[model samples]
Target: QNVWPRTFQNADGSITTIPSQPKRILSTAVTVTGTLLAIDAPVIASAATTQSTFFEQWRKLAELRQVKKLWPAGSVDLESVYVEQPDLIVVSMIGADSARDQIPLLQAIAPTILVDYSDQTWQSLAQQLGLATGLEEQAERTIHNFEQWTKQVRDVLDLPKGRANIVSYHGPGVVNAVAKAQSAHAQLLQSVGVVLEEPDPAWQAGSIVHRDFLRIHYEHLTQLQAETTFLITMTDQQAQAFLHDPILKNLPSIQRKQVYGLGENSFRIDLFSAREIINSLLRRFAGEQAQSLVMPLEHHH
Candidate 1:
């Protein structure tokens, strides 16, 4: 009943005029879709992964909410989105998941809003999308509840000694190491009193892959100095493929068994995945009985 038309400054320095609160919101990235769901946005449809759903954490909720899967994850299909008749289009500006390039075409179908996920926290993201969907209060309440929950976890959770590092391995030589403190996933762990391992400043072995992540080959894995290592997007056994390597077996984390899995969706921090990670940590570290996330979860492809 309030403002029917308003302008928004986008992450890419563009401006959009949303005519009204979005009734049928269409999300262009699976990454952004999770936050929309957390805020109870009217997300009628979304792009999906090869899993035929959102990331591992929130895929079930997408089905429960009946969000239509319009197309595959990587491809940007304007025809399908246009046919859905969405009142507002939500797109992320960066990441492997990005719909920034197709904004012009989507705007022709409806008001398109761009959100930059690389730099902002999920709480901030919820606020932005919630405002667009006219659910600002819901967004605030969600953020507050999460903050309170984190405080509770931090008050009781016991983290391992020495600094920790977050890394993900795709194959033989493909490993992405978290290189910056501002990474969303890094911030999540840091909130619970975990000091992160700093990326070496030299940058000789490899280079930055994308925002806050460095792609270093296995040869450089020898130099990983962190005593505690959390492997993103991997199960403890799948990570064992790398951990059991004769050369790697001597690393402190492996020797002490401080290496653990942060779940498949750990690389990204959305409301659902964040909640799952906190719960997993609580389960794994409460009494310190579970040494690793050894529960035979499939490897991240």
Candidate 2:
């Protein structure tokens, strides 16, 4: 009998060991779902947002892979997870938080691994997951290809040397401006030679949930002082609505029309979603140059 045990330290400081390679993986986090898909991991089931729920990148990928959705827009049904019969279960801090006390229940079904995304880059996450799943070679190759692609886009676009501010608007009065090393949004822009603004004191004092972003009112938009602004919104109409605000109209991005819009998928750093953000930026900034290039599949529309 060939029985190989796989062990790793989880985010909660507990150790987990799978009896052997996982045949069916249940991804409890959209972020992990996207990464696992990007690396061609065997993800049989996942927690996902619907087509209208936002973060279309992963949802679209899941559809293409024909992976079953365990949790939709509303609550995650643990009974559904049992029905899927996943041999391995992977979750992110966000998803795990929802079933905080129910982790043991999950472990009873299958080996459960919790991934902490608090301060890791997409490449790092890819490599980490690769190690966990024994797909080290594929993970290494994915990182290499991604790095090459990033270099190509950076060279082609030649974005001007300046600072950029990445923000996500919840509604009229609230906005979360990304200004920390943990942000994949900021990391992607910085990789392409764009400097990010420093985090304000309020941002620095925020909790781990706010690791990559700072919550502020609409009135504080000007304080970001960025040459360009990347707005993650639900729709282009939402972007336009935010730009039309009287206070926002006075911002430099509005003044110069340098604001770029992305959907919610770009808000987090997953291998595939990060690539979409890069492709989106290239298409927006490279102009005629980008027309000849083939953007990543996820960025289409």
Candidate 3:
């Protein structure tokens, strides 16, 4: 009951020391706030944006908790975060960061800790937050429960044979293929025996440096074609669009009805989105409807 003066390493490769357990926590990143809420951390506010106000999968839960919107997505207003009178603050958002620019400003208000939720699993981030806030029990609890659920899914679901491919469809012609061994989504799917194939480096367009989502020419997509294909979608209709695209229709996966979305809010996965991914697989493979996304942590069992 007396966890205090904790010094820990942040996801950003920086050091942070909490003077005591935080009674009031403020989150300046939408990406980080979801996990805080999932662990039942005492977060006071979070940033919201037109790009992603909150994930659709767990947007209602944030509302249910009455977590205040600290500021707009891009601008990190120090006064807005300051007024909350938080003892601890978290600054983060993935797909890289502009949020890093605000760290110096946020530290003036509280013990500001920033994490780059990009390179690791949601479970890893959960453990890190647990250490930072003295909620290690809650972190491990959710992690173990999700693990149990995932194991159950693996046992019952019928996984498609051979390798799979995942695409982030920006539009009809603008699709980026997810590279194997580089994404949490792919890693999780790999754990359940679904290995997503990466497109060849030679076919990549331009000089993009990031290997996670590589821009590949639509005509060359046939090279990475696998037995099953998944799309990272923001909507069901978008998944249909990819499944039914005239240019892509000739591909065997679409013809076989193997193309499916990872549910809405599939991109930038947290615990909520991870469950959405698992739920979709269960429905397609086992024809089972899993639990709803809005259930509170208590209902996770």
Candidate 1, backbone clash total: 0
Candidate 2 global CA lDDT score? 0.70
Candidate 3, poorest ten consecutive residues by summed lDDT: 289-298
Off by over 4 Å in 3: 50-52, 93-97, 171-175, 209-211, 288-301
- How many backbone clashes does every candidate have? 0, 0, 0
Model 2 bad stretches (over 4 Å): 1-3, 50-55, 95-98, 158-161, 170-172, 203-209, 234-236, 298-301
**Candidate 2 lDDT score at position 218:** 54
Which model, 1 or 3, shows the larger lDDT?
A: 1
- lDDT of the candidates, in the order given: 0.77, 0.70, 0.73
Residue pairs clashing, model 2: none
Model 3 over residues 1-301: C-alpha lDDT tens digits? 6568988787667888899999798887777888898788988778776464766666777777878876667767788777889999887745422377877777877898878676667788899999888899999998898777777777766777777888776544564555545777777787656866766777677776553566766766655567778887645667887776677776667767777777767776688888778877776676543342222334543
On TM-score, the stronger of 1 and 2 is 1
Output the TM-score of candidate 3. Answer: 0.87
